Ligand binder design. Structure first.
Ligand SMILES: Nc1ncnc2c1ncn2[C@@H]1O[C@H](COP(=O)(O)OP(=O)(O)NP(=O)(O)O)[C@@H](O)[C@H]1O
Ligand SMILES: Nc1ncnc2c1ncn2[C@@H]1O[C@H](COP(=O)(O)OP(=O)(O)NP(=O)(O)O)[C@@H](O)[C@H]1O
Ligand SMILES: [Cl-]
Ligand SMILES: [K+]
Ligand SMILES: [K+]
Ligand SMILES: [Mg+2]
Ligand SMILES: [Mg+2]
Lengths: 311, 315
């Protein structure tokens, strides 16, 4: 089973406390529910792609701890290759500690942990799998040198690079743009990266063009309920792809659903137009918002309309 | 091997993130370290008593989950009986999500979880062990009704009750006071319970008298570095028991150290005066503040002065 989608990126344990009020400095507050979830942008993306039918491989590092062992089982239960899922005793599995009130306001503390210890030696071991893939997906949740090396390796073998600059930082290494065949981010990330205000699809088109001029081949900005905007070196005029209105239950994880869907279409449906791929990816992400949670909300092929898988 | 000290109360997994600044509403920040620890007032108290040499048993409920299985191992490693450590599939193990900055300031979110599912049926199964104890310790980190049930059972069997109303509730059922042989709380809890300011020993004396009149046999209010204040039905005049000054490294868990030490003394040295017990308990809690962490800071008998273990009054 040759993997067509390789994700080099993060696995994180989500530790979620639900409360009626958020704490201030020095305060202890009592909440009403705690749960553990599997997260991390890399793993989220990988899971969505796998559930659509992709043969995937997750290159990542977790701890030699209960959370790490559980994450490995999570990837296996989602039919993801863990050949290059490493474990280390030198850091805990990455964690996202999330406090959420009943209005959806939150405080989040991320400790990337073992994710940061995925190094270039670890990557090099995956060279053969990377070279045989169709798509390589990376984000900004591991150590930058490792993600840059992954993108470089993909480019050397002609593998399509899908980069999600999330979470965004203002002064991103220029190579992230120049190594990206497809660069996909949300409005708030676009603002951080470009310094422009993005309040509309037109505004997103202006931000996208800055990103394009930094060296990306294709730029997509997701707009939540307003769909997405795309432009490319060959077609630099922005195109707004809207999505039909749905009643959202929980929008958490929608961006990773979108990126994982796009990876699937890039790998398995390469002759579809970009606009068609984005229409389908918008639809799948909009399914995800109609269920609670992150990975638990990501739809399987069997539960989706047949027309999403016709060519 | 009869358990002399039975703690009916909470176990909580501490989920700790270390950061350079504490976040406010709406913020996402990155920290530099995450680790898991063991907490919960009931388990903390039980651990300190066990380390002093008590035969203890923890009546508690955790989840049928990794955190719960780990907690059971923690109690076993501290030589605590786990015969009444229940598990449930109906809720996660209780959690304390803790964010700490480089100066040691924190924000905490507690989700009681499986602790709230410790129920009447569980207490009935524990009834024989409760009834045969010397001291039954409880707090307010389980369902209040379950703590009240445990106090009731202990009282009916003539077992000494040590009640720590923590965290405090302003409209606590009157029976909590009348079922409490020893009622022990800190300044902030005393303020909630009495509606007085409690900052000083004098303040604590005034608050303690309000509590005593509600039906407690003995009231103790702890004062951090200033020791504690005690009064009783037999001796209603407040006595301030000071503690010798130490260099505090980390005061987390000191209150639970104090209560676990007091439970040990009530069970194994019942002949001693309150003042004697409290001097010793103050000293043990002050040892705990000289080391990092919560349970890991609690001293063992073998590492403490011999004078703490004499059967008779000491100067
Ligand atoms: N309320 C919504 N209704 C319909 N589709 C939605 C809604 N919110 C999000 N989506 C879809 O999900 C995609 C991604 O949402 P968006 O909020 O831009 O992602 P994000 O902020 O990157 N989230 P994430 O990366 O998982 O943390 C959008 O382009 C839509 O296709
Ligand atoms: N800085 C300190 N120096 C010396 N002894 C201390 C200090 N802080 C606390 N103690 C001892 O610890 C006891 C209890 O401390 P206190 O701060 O009153 O507990 P609490 O606030 O109920 N803590 P906890 O219940 O564990 O969260 C005091 O009576 C002292 O004996
Ligand atoms: Cl880290
Ligand atoms: K969702
Ligand atoms: K300590
Ligand atoms: Mg996103
Ligand atoms: Mg206390």
């Amino acid at each position: 089973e040759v993997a067509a989608v390789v994700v080099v990126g993060s696995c994180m344990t989500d530790l979620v406390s639900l409360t009626s009020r958020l704490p201030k400095t020095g305060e202890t507050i009592h909440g009403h529910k705690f749960f553990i979830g599997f997260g991390g942008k890399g793993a989220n993306q990988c899971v969505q792609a796998a559930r659509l039918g992709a043969m995937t491989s997750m290159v990542c590092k977790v701890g030699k701890d209960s959370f790490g062992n559980d994450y490995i089982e999570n990837l296996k239960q989602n039919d993801i290759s863990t050949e290059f899922t490493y474990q280390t005793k030198d850091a805990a599995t990455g964690t996202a500690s999330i406090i959420v009130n009943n209005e959806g306001q939150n405080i989040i503390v991320i400790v990337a942990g073992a994710n940061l210890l995925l190094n270039t030696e670890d990557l090099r071991a995956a060279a053969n799998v990377i070279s045989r893939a169709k798509v390589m997906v990376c984000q900004l949740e591991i150590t930058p040198a490792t993600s840059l090396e992954a993108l470089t390796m993909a480019r050397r073998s002609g593998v399509k690079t899908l980069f999600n600059p999330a979470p965004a930082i203002a002064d991103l290494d220029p190579q992230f743009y120049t190594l990206s065949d497809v660069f996909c981010c949300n409005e708030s990330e676009a603002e951080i990266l470009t310094g422009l205000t993005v309040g509309s699809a037109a505004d997103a088109g202006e931000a996208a063009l800055v990103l394009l001029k930094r060296g990306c081949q294709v730029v997509i900005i997701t707009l939540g309920a307003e769909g997405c905007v795309v432009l490319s070196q060959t077609e630099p005029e922005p195109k707004h792809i809207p999505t039909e209105k749905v009643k959202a239950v929980d929008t958490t994880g929608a961006g990773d659903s979108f990126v994982g869907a796009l990876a699937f279409y890039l790998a398995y449906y390469p002759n579809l137009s970009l606009e068609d791929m984005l229409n389908r990816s918008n639809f799948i992400a909009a399914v995800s918002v109609q269920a609670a949670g992150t990975q638990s909300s990501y739809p399987y092929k069997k539960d989706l309309p047949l027309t999403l898988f016709l060519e």
